[PDB]
Design a protein around this ligand. Sequence first.
Ligand SMILES: Nc1ncnc2c1ncn2[C@@H]1O[C@H](COP(=O)(O)OP(=O)(O)OP(=O)(O)O)[C@@H](O)[C@H]1O
Ligand SMILES: Nc1ncnc2c1ncn2[C@@H]1O[C@H](COP(=O)(O)OP(=O)(O)OP(=O)(O)O)[C@@H](O)[C@H]1O
Ligand SMILES: Nc1ncnc2c1ncn2[C@@H]1O[C@H](COP(=O)(O)OP(=O)(O)O)[C@@H](O)[C@H]1O
Length: 748
Amino acid sequence: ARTLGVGKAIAVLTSGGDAQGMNAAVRAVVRVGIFTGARVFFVHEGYQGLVDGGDHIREATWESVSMMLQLGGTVIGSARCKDFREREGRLRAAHNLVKRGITNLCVIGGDGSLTGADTFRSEWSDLLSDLQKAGKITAEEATRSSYLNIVGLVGSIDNDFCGTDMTIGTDSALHRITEIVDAITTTAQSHQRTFVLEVMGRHCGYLALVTSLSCGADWVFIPECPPDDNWEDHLCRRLSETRTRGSRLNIIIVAEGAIDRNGKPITSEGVKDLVVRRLGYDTRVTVLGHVQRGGTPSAFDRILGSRMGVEAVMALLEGTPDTPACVVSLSGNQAVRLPLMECVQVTKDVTKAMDEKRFDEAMKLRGRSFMNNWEVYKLLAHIRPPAPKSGSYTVAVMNVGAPAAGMNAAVRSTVRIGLIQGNRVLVVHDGFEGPAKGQIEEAGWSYVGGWTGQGGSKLGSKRTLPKKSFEQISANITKFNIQGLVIIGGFEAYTGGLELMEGRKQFDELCIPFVVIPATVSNNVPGSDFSVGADTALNTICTTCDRIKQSAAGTKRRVFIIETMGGYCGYLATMAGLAAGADAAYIFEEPFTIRDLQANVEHLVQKMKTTVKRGLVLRNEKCNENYTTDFIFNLYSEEGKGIFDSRKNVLGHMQQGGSPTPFDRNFATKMGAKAMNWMAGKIKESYRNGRIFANTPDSGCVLGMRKRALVFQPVTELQNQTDFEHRIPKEQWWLKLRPILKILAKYE
Ligand SMILES: Nc1ncnc2c1ncn2[C@@H]1O[C@H](COP(=O)(O)OP(=O)(O)OP(=O)(O)O)[C@@H](O)[C@H]1O
Ligand SMILES: Nc1ncnc2c1ncn2[C@@H]1O[C@H](COP(=O)(O)OP(=O)(O)OP(=O)(O)O)[C@@H](O)[C@H]1O
Ligand SMILES: Nc1ncnc2c1ncn2[C@@H]1O[C@H](COP(=O)(O)OP(=O)(O)O)[C@@H](O)[C@H]1O
């Protein structure tokens, strides 16, 4: 609370290497730190300034963290101080803390920096008694004893640290790597070019794998699972197999830490030599390096930064001389404070486990999803697939609703994974106008060839519903022999789904199972924390939001009022509102009354009249029937005549058919499989007498993100979890963020 951090001060620090998002962390850490009545102190140049001190520990204001969200790298500054790795230095830093009076320390760093603060919290007890032989009056130690709180905030493009689902910057890092391959990829038209990108990752194959999974890398090399035995043949057999199979380029991604069975490291150049000496294609190595850390932080990292930042400060002010070292982080999409020590002691475990040829233990300590990506990567990466028999179940996949960045990525694994099960996969053009009009084709392994990155809807998606035409579709699911349905779409996929169950009452054909994969820009589908195409949309809003915070204004001081899309769902606006640090984001799920709206302005003004020079006001395209854009606009204008200028922008639905970011391509790839695996089951389990009869509710689901796991939920079970008037779910997780979004704008 406002009185919580009163009579309390904290010093934030940014050790480790530049990770896009650190800046948002700091900001949040300062903004929320003040807010809690506490005092926040900067500490330029990572652990260094802490050791040094003096002019390296300046005090932060609120205006100080202004306009940082959008900036990459660290601004508080990051060094490499090795003096701290020794006590002949930690003691001087401590001196600096106690000399400046500070009981809380936020460390935004990596596996090492984090492990350093760790050992610091520990070797802190004796640090007093020793720095007492001559340090400062012993009156202080008896006034700052077993009270040295430190929160570790994980920032690293490695995504190595264990205990956190994501680290800062890795998504942006993912964007960089992606934009390149995205470009490498869309040019190779001449010779059978064969790029050999080498990407980051000391000991972690993460970025390397994930980047292969989004590009459709032809082969990959990662640490935790070295290519044991004669592979070159394999890799060449492959590259040639695929060469004659008809293809232009090839993208062999290589993690830096890429080693082999024994350990004698695989080299990006070596790889390059191989292919040329054995196959002789014009191969060309590239080594992205230190650019992955560049560019600007993606919508996710800015957001993730702010969330972690707030978590830290809370965790800092909620500490007790009996509470252990803390490391806040994300998991199952919610903040968590984890035992610093436990995290380090383990995140280390993986290294040794890897030092000993024990890679199974490696890939395990890493495990879960990682292991999955690996598994799914290889599968979809195959050149094959198997020989199609006859007793094979035949599935149909289709798109329904407005298009999304990821649909084609989902349709591609759905078909590949299907085909690899030995099942048949039909492809439907134009959603439900699909099984109905009869536009249905058989999709072979190549049909989906290189789609994972293409945006829009290759198959065609319409929003029309099934019911009105059960006759024709059922007529068709019999003719073509459809025996399961995979629907990638948004609300009218969920909705058209329910619409299918009822049919199971009047029709026996509709008595097949179906899974609904959420693909909607708006993130309005019930039964999942995320949907495919939101991140992509979101990243574009957040982008143009930043580009608009410029405008060739004939003078400074100016306020922008922007209307986002997403019908009644305040996900984008709220999120974008937070990613681009707007003063206000008017959404539906959170009703405003002119009594408020007023106060929201008799506020930005009190700011445009000082600190702030550009203002951001986000409005959900449906937050309120009366208080339209134009209303909010005009209100904000008049009220600020003289003090500032103002323009109003309506983004609207700027062709959401651009291109999927790496996260939607992964998300749509991972599910498209998860579903096609789950569905192959429900189809066996529903085969009875030379016919299938799914008439239970389990056979009709929507697969979605729900906390730490993906989960199949039956459409009917969700009916009472969804407001159909406004086509949105009831209980949106993110409404939990609104408050932080508000304190960062300096409210309450
Ligand atoms: N093992 C350690 N013990 C104590 N302090 C450390 C340790 N490792 C790093 N530090 C502190 O952090 C500084 C920078 O370390 P480092 O470059 O490893 O950052 P990091 O958090 O490990 O991120 P990265 O994954 O890029 O290594 C060191 O100079 C020292 O100040
Ligand atoms: N794309 C890939 N990247 C890295 N390793 C791969 C890839 N594809 C297969 N492998 C490796 O090849 C070995 C398994 O071969 P599998 O028998 O699983 O594929 P395959 O049928 O021989 O090849 P294809 O599927 O290219 O004919 C394992 O080491 C597996 O990790
Ligand atoms: N861009 C993002 N937007 C929302 N959540 C994200 C994003 N990137 C990662 N996450 C979170 O990271 C965790 C999932 O990581 P993971 O299983 O490795 O999937 P991927 O392999 O797609 O990262 C979840 O908490 C997920 O919500």
